Protein backbone atom coordinates (compact mmCIF):
# COMPACT_ATOMS: atom_id res chain seq x y z
CA UNK A 1 0.00 0.00 0.00
CA UNK A 2 2.32 2.72 1.26
CA UNK A 3 5.26 0.42 0.56
CA UNK A 4 4.75 0.84 -3.19
CA UNK A 5 4.81 4.61 -2.79
CA UNK A 6 7.96 4.24 -0.69
CA UNK A 7 9.62 2.02 -3.31
CA UNK A 8 8.90 4.53 -6.08
CA UNK A 9 9.96 7.40 -3.83
CA UNK A 10 13.40 5.90 -3.22
CA UNK A 11 13.71 4.77 -6.84
CA UNK A 12 13.60 8.45 -7.80
CA UNK A 13 16.33 9.39 -5.32
CA UNK A 14 18.59 6.74 -6.83
CA UNK A 15 18.31 8.48 -10.20
CA UNK A 16 18.88 11.94 -8.73
CA UNK A 17 22.06 10.64 -7.10
CA UNK A 18 23.05 9.19 -10.47
CA UNK A 19 22.68 12.67 -12.02
CA UNK A 20 24.70 14.46 -9.33
CA UNK A 21 27.43 11.82 -9.49
CA UNK A 22 27.66 12.05 -13.27
CA UNK A 23 28.02 15.82 -13.03
CA UNK A 24 30.80 15.63 -10.44
CA UNK A 25 32.71 12.81 -12.13
CA UNK A 26 32.54 14.21 -15.66
CA UNK A 27 33.73 17.50 -14.19
CA UNK A 28 36.73 15.79 -12.61
CA UNK A 29 37.51 14.07 -15.92
CA UNK A 30 37.23 17.36 -17.84
CA UNK A 31 39.57 19.15 -15.44
CA UNK A 32 41.94 16.20 -15.70
CA UNK A 33 41.95 16.49 -19.49
CA UNK A 34 42.73 20.22 -19.44
CA UNK A 35 45.45 19.56 -16.87
CA UNK A 36 46.98 16.96 -19.19
CA UNK A 37 46.90 19.51 -22.01
CA UNK A 38 48.82 21.96 -19.81
CA UNK A 39 51.41 19.62 -18.31
CA UNK A 40 52.20 17.37 -21.28
CA UNK A 41 52.45 20.07 -23.96
CA UNK A 42 52.72 23.63 -22.63
CA UNK A 43 55.07 22.88 -19.73
CA UNK A 44 57.28 20.88 -22.08
CA UNK A 45 57.68 23.53 -24.77
CA UNK A 46 58.17 26.12 -22.03
CA UNK A 47 60.90 23.99 -20.43
CA UNK A 48 62.98 24.44 -23.58
CA UNK A 49 61.89 26.97 -26.20
CA UNK A 50 65.01 26.33 -28.28
CA UNK A 51 63.94 22.82 -29.25
CA UNK A 52 60.34 23.84 -29.95
CA UNK A 53 61.39 26.77 -32.16
CA UNK A 54 64.15 24.87 -33.98
CA UNK A 55 61.94 21.86 -34.68
CA UNK A 56 59.26 24.18 -36.08
CA UNK A 57 57.13 25.68 -33.30
CA UNK A 58 57.14 29.47 -33.13
CA UNK A 59 55.36 31.07 -30.17
CA UNK A 60 52.77 32.44 -32.60
CA UNK A 61 51.77 28.86 -33.34
CA UNK A 62 51.46 27.84 -29.68
CA UNK A 63 49.50 31.01 -28.93
CA UNK A 64 47.03 30.40 -31.78
CA UNK A 65 46.76 26.64 -31.15
CA UNK A 66 46.01 26.54 -27.44
CA UNK A 67 44.13 29.87 -27.26
CA UNK A 68 42.97 30.73 -23.74
CA UNK A 69 42.65 27.12 -22.56
CA UNK A 70 44.55 27.81 -19.34
CA UNK A 71 42.05 30.48 -18.31
CA UNK A 72 39.21 28.00 -18.86
CA UNK A 73 41.19 25.56 -16.73
CA UNK A 74 41.64 28.17 -13.98
CA UNK A 75 37.88 28.67 -14.03
CA UNK A 76 37.08 24.95 -13.83
CA UNK A 77 39.52 24.31 -10.97
CA UNK A 78 37.51 26.74 -8.87
CA UNK A 79 34.20 25.47 -10.23
CA UNK A 80 35.12 21.85 -9.53
CA UNK A 81 36.25 22.85 -6.04
CA UNK A 82 32.88 24.52 -5.50
CA UNK A 83 31.16 21.32 -6.63
CA UNK A 84 33.26 19.19 -4.27
CA UNK A 85 32.38 21.62 -1.50
CA UNK A 86 28.64 21.47 -2.22
CA UNK A 87 28.61 17.69 -2.63
CA UNK A 88 30.45 16.92 0.62
CA UNK A 89 31.49 14.21 0.91
CA UNK A 90 29.41 12.51 -1.79
CA UNK A 91 26.16 13.45 -3.61
CA UNK A 92 23.19 13.22 -1.25
CA UNK A 93 19.47 13.66 -1.98
CA UNK A 94 19.07 16.97 -0.15
CA UNK A 95 22.18 18.52 -1.71
CA UNK A 96 21.39 21.55 -3.86
CA UNK A 97 23.61 22.36 -6.84
CA UNK A 98 21.76 25.07 -8.79
CA UNK A 99 23.36 27.87 -6.80
CA UNK A 100 26.88 26.71 -7.68
CA UNK A 101 25.89 26.90 -11.35
CA UNK A 102 24.35 30.34 -10.85
CA UNK A 103 27.41 31.60 -8.95
CA UNK A 104 29.67 30.67 -11.86
CA UNK A 105 27.55 31.80 -14.83
CA UNK A 106 29.34 35.04 -15.75
CA UNK A 107 32.62 33.17 -15.25
CA UNK A 108 32.00 30.96 -18.29
CA UNK A 109 32.20 33.78 -20.86
CA UNK A 110 35.88 32.81 -21.17
CA UNK A 111 34.74 30.14 -23.65
CA UNK A 112 33.69 32.80 -26.18
CA UNK A 113 37.32 33.55 -27.04
CA UNK A 114 38.26 29.88 -27.38
CA UNK A 115 35.54 28.61 -29.75
CA UNK A 116 35.82 31.60 -32.10
CA UNK A 117 39.56 30.96 -32.35
CA UNK A 118 39.30 27.18 -32.54
CA UNK A 119 38.31 27.20 -36.23
CA UNK A 120 41.67 28.79 -36.96
CA UNK A 121 43.56 26.61 -34.47
CA UNK A 122 42.73 23.28 -36.10
CA UNK A 123 43.30 24.82 -39.53
CA UNK A 124 46.74 25.84 -38.30
CA UNK A 125 47.28 22.39 -36.80
CA UNK A 126 46.78 20.56 -40.11
CA UNK A 127 49.60 22.69 -41.53
CA UNK A 128 51.97 21.99 -38.63
CA UNK A 129 51.34 18.26 -38.96
CA UNK A 130 52.68 18.31 -42.52
CA UNK A 131 56.02 19.44 -41.11
CA UNK A 132 57.92 16.27 -40.11
CA UNK A 133 59.70 17.44 -36.95
CA UNK A 134 56.63 19.32 -35.69
CA UNK A 135 54.33 16.31 -36.00
CA UNK A 136 57.04 14.12 -34.48
CA UNK A 137 57.39 16.61 -31.61
CA UNK A 138 53.64 16.67 -30.98
CA UNK A 139 53.64 12.87 -30.89
CA UNK A 140 56.65 12.89 -28.57
CA UNK A 141 54.73 15.05 -26.11
CA UNK A 142 51.91 12.50 -26.12
CA UNK A 143 54.32 9.60 -25.59
CA UNK A 144 56.27 11.26 -22.76
CA UNK A 145 52.90 12.08 -21.20
CA UNK A 146 52.38 8.35 -20.72
CA UNK A 147 49.46 8.10 -23.13
CA UNK A 148 49.41 6.12 -26.36
CA UNK A 149 49.43 6.59 -30.14
CA UNK A 150 46.14 4.77 -30.74
CA UNK A 151 44.68 6.95 -27.98
CA UNK A 152 42.80 10.16 -28.84
CA UNK A 153 45.19 12.72 -30.43
CA UNK A 154 45.74 16.41 -29.63
CA UNK A 155 42.89 17.48 -31.91
CA UNK A 156 40.15 15.90 -29.81
CA UNK A 157 41.60 17.24 -26.57
CA UNK A 158 41.50 20.69 -28.13
CA UNK A 159 37.94 19.99 -29.23
CA UNK A 160 36.78 19.01 -25.73
CA UNK A 161 35.65 22.39 -24.34
CA UNK A 162 33.00 23.06 -27.01
CA UNK A 163 31.60 19.62 -26.22
CA UNK A 164 31.78 20.16 -22.47
CA UNK A 165 30.02 23.53 -22.24
CA UNK A 166 27.06 22.27 -24.30
CA UNK A 167 26.39 19.30 -22.02
CA UNK A 168 25.66 21.12 -18.76
CA UNK A 169 22.10 22.04 -19.84
CA UNK A 170 21.26 18.38 -20.52
CA UNK A 171 22.58 17.39 -17.10
CA UNK A 172 20.48 20.20 -15.62
CA UNK A 173 17.33 19.11 -17.45
CA UNK A 174 17.68 15.56 -16.17
CA UNK A 175 18.42 17.03 -12.74
CA UNK A 176 15.35 19.27 -12.85
CA UNK A 177 13.49 16.14 -13.90
CA UNK A 178 14.64 14.14 -10.87
CA UNK A 179 14.11 17.07 -8.50
CA UNK A 180 10.75 17.10 -6.67
CA UNK A 181 8.55 20.20 -6.88
CA UNK A 182 8.79 21.26 -3.24
CA UNK A 183 12.50 20.45 -3.07
CA UNK A 184 14.50 23.56 -2.06
CA UNK A 185 16.83 23.10 -5.03
CA UNK A 186 14.11 22.95 -7.71
CA UNK A 187 13.84 26.67 -8.57
CA UNK A 188 17.61 27.14 -8.41
CA UNK A 189 17.93 24.20 -10.80
CA UNK A 190 15.48 25.68 -13.30
CA UNK A 191 17.23 29.06 -13.11
CA UNK A 192 20.65 27.43 -13.50
CA UNK A 193 19.38 25.59 -16.57
CA UNK A 194 18.20 28.84 -18.17
CA UNK A 195 21.51 30.55 -17.38
CA UNK A 196 23.61 27.70 -18.78
CA UNK A 197 21.54 27.70 -21.97
CA UNK A 198 22.08 31.45 -22.28
CA UNK A 199 25.84 30.86 -21.98
CA UNK A 200 25.88 28.55 -25.00
CA UNK A 201 23.69 31.01 -26.91
CA UNK A 202 26.20 33.81 -26.26
CA UNK A 203 29.17 31.65 -27.31
CA UNK A 204 27.44 30.59 -30.53
CA UNK A 205 26.30 34.07 -31.57
CA UNK A 206 29.72 35.48 -30.72
CA UNK A 207 31.32 33.00 -33.11
CA UNK A 208 28.72 33.91 -35.75
CA UNK A 209 29.22 37.68 -35.68
CA UNK A 210 32.99 37.13 -35.58
CA UNK A 211 32.74 35.06 -38.76
CA UNK A 212 30.61 37.73 -40.46
CA UNK A 213 33.19 40.38 -39.60
CA UNK A 214 35.90 38.13 -41.05
CA UNK A 215 33.78 37.74 -44.18
CA UNK A 216 33.75 41.52 -44.60
CA UNK A 217 37.52 41.61 -44.01
CA UNK A 218 38.08 38.96 -46.67
CA UNK A 219 35.83 40.74 -49.16
CA UNK A 220 37.79 43.96 -48.68
CA UNK A 221 41.06 42.06 -49.03
CA UNK A 222 39.87 40.77 -52.41
CA UNK A 223 39.06 44.23 -53.81
CA UNK A 224 41.67 46.50 -55.40
CA UNK A 225 41.31 50.28 -55.40
CA UNK A 226 39.03 50.54 -52.38
CA UNK A 227 38.09 54.10 -51.45
CA UNK A 228 36.95 55.61 -48.16
CA UNK A 229 36.79 54.02 -44.71
CA UNK A 230 36.94 50.24 -44.29
CA UNK A 231 33.86 48.01 -44.19
CA UNK A 232 34.86 46.80 -40.73
CA UNK A 233 34.46 50.33 -39.37
CA UNK A 234 30.91 50.96 -40.58
CA UNK A 235 29.46 47.56 -41.48
CA UNK A 236 28.59 44.40 -39.55
CA UNK A 237 27.50 41.89 -42.20
CA UNK A 238 26.98 41.27 -45.91
CA UNK A 239 23.29 40.97 -46.79
CA UNK A 240 23.23 40.18 -50.51
CA UNK A 241 25.50 40.01 -53.57
CA UNK A 242 24.97 39.51 -57.30
CA UNK A 243 25.63 40.68 -60.86
CA UNK A 244 23.74 43.63 -62.35
CA UNK A 245 23.92 45.75 -65.50
CA UNK A 246 24.92 49.31 -64.63
CA UNK A 247 24.02 52.19 -66.94
CA UNK A 248 25.76 55.34 -65.71
CA UNK A 249 26.81 58.56 -67.48
CA UNK A 250 26.15 56.91 -70.83
CA UNK A 251 28.30 53.90 -69.97
CA UNK A 252 26.98 50.34 -70.03
CA UNK A 253 28.91 48.15 -67.60
CA UNK A 254 28.17 44.77 -66.04
CA UNK A 255 29.15 44.98 -62.37
CA UNK A 256 29.29 42.91 -59.19
CA UNK A 257 27.09 44.44 -56.49
CA UNK A 258 27.49 43.92 -52.74
CA UNK A 259 24.81 45.09 -50.30
CA UNK A 260 26.08 45.71 -46.77
CA UNK A 261 24.06 47.11 -43.90
CA UNK A 262 24.70 50.90 -44.15
CA UNK A 263 26.02 50.87 -47.76
CA UNK A 264 26.08 49.38 -51.28
CA UNK A 265 29.18 48.71 -53.41
CA UNK A 266 29.69 48.02 -57.13
CA UNK A 267 32.89 46.57 -58.61
CA UNK A 268 34.34 45.38 -61.92
CA UNK A 269 34.84 41.61 -61.95
CA UNK A 270 38.33 40.65 -63.16
CA UNK A 271 42.25 40.43 -56.08
CA UNK A 272 39.08 39.22 -57.80
CA UNK A 273 37.39 42.60 -58.19
CA UNK A 274 38.18 46.24 -58.97
CA UNK A 275 36.41 48.89 -56.89
CA UNK A 276 34.08 51.00 -59.03
CA UNK A 277 31.89 52.77 -56.46
CA UNK A 278 30.21 53.01 -53.07
CA UNK A 279 26.95 54.53 -51.82
CA UNK A 280 25.88 55.14 -48.23
CA UNK A 281 22.33 53.77 -47.93
CA UNK A 282 21.50 56.64 -45.56
CA UNK A 283 21.73 58.95 -48.58
CA UNK A 284 20.48 56.52 -51.21
CA UNK A 285 17.07 56.53 -52.90
CA UNK A 286 16.15 53.41 -54.87
CA UNK A 287 13.23 53.92 -57.24
CA UNK A 288 11.46 51.14 -59.13
CA UNK A 289 11.33 51.45 -62.91
CA UNK A 290 8.42 49.75 -64.68
CA UNK A 291 9.49 47.26 -67.34
CA UNK A 292 9.28 48.66 -70.86
CA UNK A 293 10.24 52.20 -69.89
CA UNK A 294 12.85 54.00 -72.00
CA UNK A 295 14.25 57.36 -70.88
CA UNK A 296 17.52 59.32 -70.86
CA UNK A 297 18.73 57.52 -67.74
CA UNK A 298 18.61 54.25 -69.68
CA UNK A 299 19.93 56.05 -72.78
CA UNK A 300 16.74 55.00 -74.55
CA UNK A 301 17.13 51.29 -73.84
CA UNK A 302 13.93 49.39 -73.06
CA UNK A 303 13.92 48.26 -69.44
CA UNK A 304 13.20 44.84 -67.96
CA UNK A 305 13.85 44.13 -64.27
CA UNK A 306 15.36 47.59 -63.89
CA UNK A 307 15.40 50.49 -61.45
CA UNK A 308 17.14 53.81 -60.79
CA UNK A 309 19.52 54.59 -57.92
CA UNK A 310 20.05 58.07 -56.50
CA UNK A 311 23.11 59.11 -54.50
CA UNK A 312 21.75 62.28 -52.89
CA UNK A 313 25.10 63.29 -51.41
CA UNK A 314 26.53 63.77 -54.90
CA UNK A 315 23.13 64.27 -56.57
CA UNK A 316 24.00 61.43 -58.94
CA UNK A 317 21.76 58.89 -60.68
CA UNK A 318 22.29 55.59 -62.49
CA UNK A 319 20.33 52.57 -63.74
CA UNK A 320 20.59 49.01 -62.43
CA UNK A 321 19.13 46.02 -64.28
CA UNK A 322 18.75 42.31 -63.62
CA UNK A 323 18.13 39.27 -65.82
CA UNK A 324 15.49 37.59 -63.66
CA UNK A 325 12.52 39.02 -61.76
CA UNK A 326 13.56 37.02 -58.70
CA UNK A 327 16.83 38.96 -58.57
CA UNK A 328 14.98 42.27 -58.68
CA UNK A 329 12.66 41.16 -55.88
CA UNK A 330 15.71 39.99 -53.92
CA UNK A 331 17.60 43.29 -54.12
CA UNK A 332 14.48 45.41 -53.53
CA UNK A 333 13.39 43.44 -50.46
CA UNK A 334 16.95 43.35 -49.11
CA UNK A 335 17.37 47.12 -49.35
CA UNK A 336 13.93 47.53 -47.76
CA UNK A 337 14.94 45.33 -44.82
CA UNK A 338 18.26 47.14 -44.42
CA UNK A 339 16.59 50.57 -44.30
CA UNK A 340 13.90 49.20 -41.98
CA UNK A 341 16.46 47.90 -39.49
CA UNK A 342 18.91 50.81 -39.62
CA UNK A 343 16.44 53.22 -37.99
CA UNK A 344 15.75 51.07 -34.93
Amino acid sequence: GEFAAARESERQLRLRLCVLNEILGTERDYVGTLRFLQSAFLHRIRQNVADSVEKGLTEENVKVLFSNIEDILEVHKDFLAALEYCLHPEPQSQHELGNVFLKFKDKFCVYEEYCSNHEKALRLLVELNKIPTVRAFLLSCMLLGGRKTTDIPLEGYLLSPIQRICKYPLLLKELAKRTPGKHPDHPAVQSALQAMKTVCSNINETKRQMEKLEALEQLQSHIEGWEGSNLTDICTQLLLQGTLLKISAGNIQERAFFLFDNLLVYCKRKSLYIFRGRINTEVMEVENVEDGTADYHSNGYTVTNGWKIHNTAKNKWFVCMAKTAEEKQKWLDAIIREREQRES
Binding site: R123, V126, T150, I152, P153, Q163, P169, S201, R208
Partner: protein, 180 residues
Amino acid sequence: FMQTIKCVVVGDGAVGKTCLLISYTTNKFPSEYVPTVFDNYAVTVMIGGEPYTLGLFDTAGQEDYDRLRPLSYPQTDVFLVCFSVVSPSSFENVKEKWVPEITHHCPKTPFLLVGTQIDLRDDPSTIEKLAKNKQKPITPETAEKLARDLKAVKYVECSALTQKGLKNVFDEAILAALEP
Protein backbone atom coordinates in the same frame (compact mmCIF):
# COMPACT_ATOMS: atom_id res chain seq x y z
CA PHE B 1 51.59 1.98 -37.13
CA MET B 2 47.85 1.36 -36.83
CA GLN B 3 45.66 3.90 -38.61
CA THR B 4 42.96 5.67 -36.61
CA ILE B 5 39.44 6.28 -37.94
CA LYS B 6 37.31 9.26 -36.88
CA CYS B 7 33.61 8.47 -36.62
CA VAL B 8 31.30 11.39 -35.86
CA VAL B 9 27.71 10.68 -34.78
CA VAL B 10 25.15 13.37 -35.65
CA GLY B 11 21.36 13.62 -35.67
CA ASP B 12 18.24 15.00 -33.99
CA GLY B 13 18.13 15.46 -30.23
CA ALA B 14 16.78 12.58 -28.14
CA VAL B 15 17.13 9.99 -30.90
CA GLY B 16 19.47 8.20 -28.53
CA LYS B 17 22.84 8.69 -30.20
CA THR B 18 24.55 9.07 -26.82
CA CYS B 19 22.79 5.97 -25.51
CA LEU B 20 23.89 4.25 -28.72
CA LEU B 21 27.55 5.14 -28.18
CA ILE B 22 27.45 4.21 -24.48
CA SER B 23 25.75 0.88 -25.20
CA TYR B 24 28.33 0.06 -27.86
CA THR B 25 31.36 1.09 -25.81
CA THR B 26 30.43 -0.44 -22.44
CA ASN B 27 27.93 -2.55 -20.55
CA LYS B 28 27.63 -2.95 -16.77
CA PHE B 29 25.44 0.11 -16.59
CA PRO B 30 22.71 -0.48 -13.99
CA SER B 31 20.49 0.22 -17.03
CA GLU B 32 17.81 2.18 -15.19
CA TYR B 33 19.76 5.41 -15.58
CA VAL B 34 20.43 7.13 -18.90
CA PRO B 35 23.84 8.85 -18.84
CA THR B 36 23.84 12.07 -20.87
CA VAL B 37 27.59 12.51 -21.36
CA PHE B 38 29.73 10.49 -23.74
CA ASP B 39 33.39 11.52 -23.80
CA ASN B 40 35.45 10.90 -26.96
CA TYR B 41 36.52 7.26 -26.94
CA ALA B 42 39.00 5.10 -28.87
CA VAL B 43 38.01 1.50 -29.65
CA THR B 44 40.22 -1.19 -31.19
CA VAL B 45 38.31 -3.22 -33.77
CA MET B 46 39.24 -6.19 -35.94
CA ILE B 47 38.60 -5.95 -39.68
CA GLY B 48 39.79 -8.76 -41.94
CA GLY B 49 42.15 -9.78 -39.16
CA GLU B 50 43.64 -6.28 -39.05
CA PRO B 51 43.24 -4.01 -35.99
CA TYR B 52 42.10 -0.40 -36.34
CA THR B 53 41.45 2.44 -33.90
CA LEU B 54 37.88 3.71 -34.10
CA GLY B 55 37.66 7.20 -32.63
CA LEU B 56 34.16 7.88 -31.34
CA PHE B 57 32.77 11.40 -31.05
CA ASP B 58 29.36 12.54 -29.79
CA THR B 59 27.44 15.67 -30.80
CA ALA B 60 24.65 15.64 -28.21
CA GLY B 61 23.75 19.05 -26.79
CA GLN B 62 24.87 20.99 -29.85
CA GLU B 63 21.55 20.62 -31.70
CA ASP B 64 20.35 24.22 -31.31
CA TYR B 65 23.80 25.68 -32.00
CA ASP B 66 24.31 25.65 -35.76
CA ARG B 67 27.55 27.64 -35.62
CA LEU B 68 29.16 25.45 -32.97
CA ARG B 69 28.39 22.08 -34.59
CA PRO B 70 30.75 22.26 -37.59
CA LEU B 71 33.74 22.63 -35.23
CA SER B 72 33.65 18.84 -34.83
CA TYR B 73 33.44 18.02 -38.55
CA PRO B 74 37.02 18.55 -39.76
CA GLN B 75 39.32 15.50 -40.03
CA THR B 76 36.25 13.23 -39.95
CA ASP B 77 36.65 9.87 -41.66
CA VAL B 78 33.01 8.75 -41.47
CA PHE B 79 29.66 10.15 -40.30
CA LEU B 80 26.73 8.41 -38.62
CA VAL B 81 23.49 10.23 -39.40
CA CYS B 82 20.96 8.96 -36.87
CA PHE B 83 17.18 9.08 -36.59
CA SER B 84 14.61 7.28 -34.44
CA VAL B 85 12.36 4.84 -36.30
CA VAL B 86 9.46 5.84 -34.04
CA SER B 87 10.09 9.54 -34.62
CA PRO B 88 9.00 10.81 -38.07
CA SER B 89 10.32 14.27 -37.15
CA SER B 90 13.92 13.07 -36.83
CA PHE B 91 13.52 11.09 -40.05
CA GLU B 92 12.42 14.27 -41.83
CA ASN B 93 15.22 16.22 -40.15
CA VAL B 94 17.79 13.88 -41.72
CA LYS B 95 16.54 15.13 -45.08
CA GLU B 96 15.99 18.76 -44.11
CA LYS B 97 19.03 19.45 -41.91
CA TRP B 98 21.79 16.93 -41.21
CA VAL B 99 22.81 15.39 -44.54
CA PRO B 100 22.90 18.79 -46.29
CA GLU B 101 25.09 20.15 -43.46
CA ILE B 102 27.63 17.32 -43.28
CA THR B 103 27.76 17.19 -47.08
CA HIS B 104 28.31 20.95 -47.16
CA HIS B 105 31.20 20.83 -44.69
CA CYS B 106 32.68 17.49 -45.80
CA PRO B 107 31.63 16.66 -49.41
CA LYS B 108 33.97 13.70 -49.95
CA THR B 109 33.51 12.08 -46.52
CA PRO B 110 31.17 9.03 -46.37
CA PHE B 111 28.14 8.79 -44.09
CA LEU B 112 25.76 6.03 -42.97
CA LEU B 113 22.02 6.25 -42.37
CA VAL B 114 21.34 4.91 -38.88
CA GLY B 115 17.87 4.01 -37.62
CA THR B 116 17.67 3.76 -33.84
CA GLN B 117 15.23 2.53 -31.19
CA ILE B 118 13.89 -0.31 -33.33
CA ASP B 119 12.84 -2.10 -30.13
CA LEU B 120 10.08 0.51 -29.84
CA ARG B 121 8.51 -0.55 -33.14
CA ASP B 122 6.42 -3.15 -31.31
CA ASP B 123 5.50 -0.89 -28.40
CA PRO B 124 1.67 -0.57 -28.41
CA SER B 125 1.88 2.64 -26.37
CA THR B 126 4.19 4.24 -28.93
CA ILE B 127 1.95 2.99 -31.73
CA GLU B 128 -1.02 4.67 -30.02
CA LYS B 129 0.89 7.93 -29.52
CA LEU B 130 1.80 7.99 -33.20
CA ALA B 131 -1.74 6.92 -34.13
CA LYS B 132 -3.09 10.07 -32.49
CA ASN B 133 -1.24 12.02 -35.18
CA LYS B 134 -2.27 9.43 -37.77
CA GLN B 135 1.44 8.62 -37.95
CA LYS B 136 3.39 5.36 -38.04
CA PRO B 137 6.98 4.16 -37.47
CA ILE B 138 9.65 4.23 -40.18
CA THR B 139 9.65 1.13 -42.37
CA PRO B 140 13.11 -0.22 -43.36
CA GLU B 141 11.97 0.06 -46.99
CA THR B 142 11.25 3.79 -46.79
CA ALA B 143 14.47 4.47 -44.92
CA GLU B 144 16.49 2.54 -47.51
CA LYS B 145 14.74 4.61 -50.17
CA LEU B 146 15.89 7.73 -48.32
CA ALA B 147 19.41 6.32 -47.98
CA ARG B 148 19.68 5.61 -51.70
CA ASP B 149 18.26 9.03 -52.54
CA LEU B 150 20.68 10.97 -50.31
CA LYS B 151 23.58 8.84 -51.57
CA ALA B 152 24.36 7.36 -48.17
CA VAL B 153 26.61 4.29 -48.19
CA LYS B 154 23.85 2.13 -46.71
CA TYR B 155 21.06 1.98 -44.14
CA VAL B 156 21.66 0.31 -40.78
CA GLU B 157 19.27 -0.36 -37.89
CA CYS B 158 20.11 -0.96 -34.24
CA SER B 159 18.75 -0.96 -30.70
CA ALA B 160 21.05 0.30 -27.94
CA LEU B 161 18.80 -1.54 -25.50
CA THR B 162 18.77 -4.91 -27.27
CA GLN B 163 22.20 -4.47 -28.92
CA LYS B 164 20.59 -5.89 -32.05
CA GLY B 165 22.78 -4.90 -34.99
CA LEU B 166 24.56 -2.36 -32.79
CA LYS B 167 28.12 -3.62 -33.32
CA ASN B 168 27.55 -4.24 -37.02
CA VAL B 169 26.61 -0.58 -37.41
CA PHE B 170 30.09 0.51 -36.36
CA ASP B 171 31.66 -2.34 -38.34
CA GLU B 172 29.90 -1.04 -41.45
CA ALA B 173 31.01 2.49 -40.54
CA ILE B 174 34.66 1.42 -40.43
CA LEU B 175 34.16 -0.45 -43.70
CA ALA B 176 32.73 2.65 -45.37
CA ALA B 177 35.66 4.66 -44.04
CA LEU B 178 38.09 2.14 -45.54
CA GLU B 179 36.68 2.59 -49.06
CA PRO B 180 39.32 3.62 -51.63
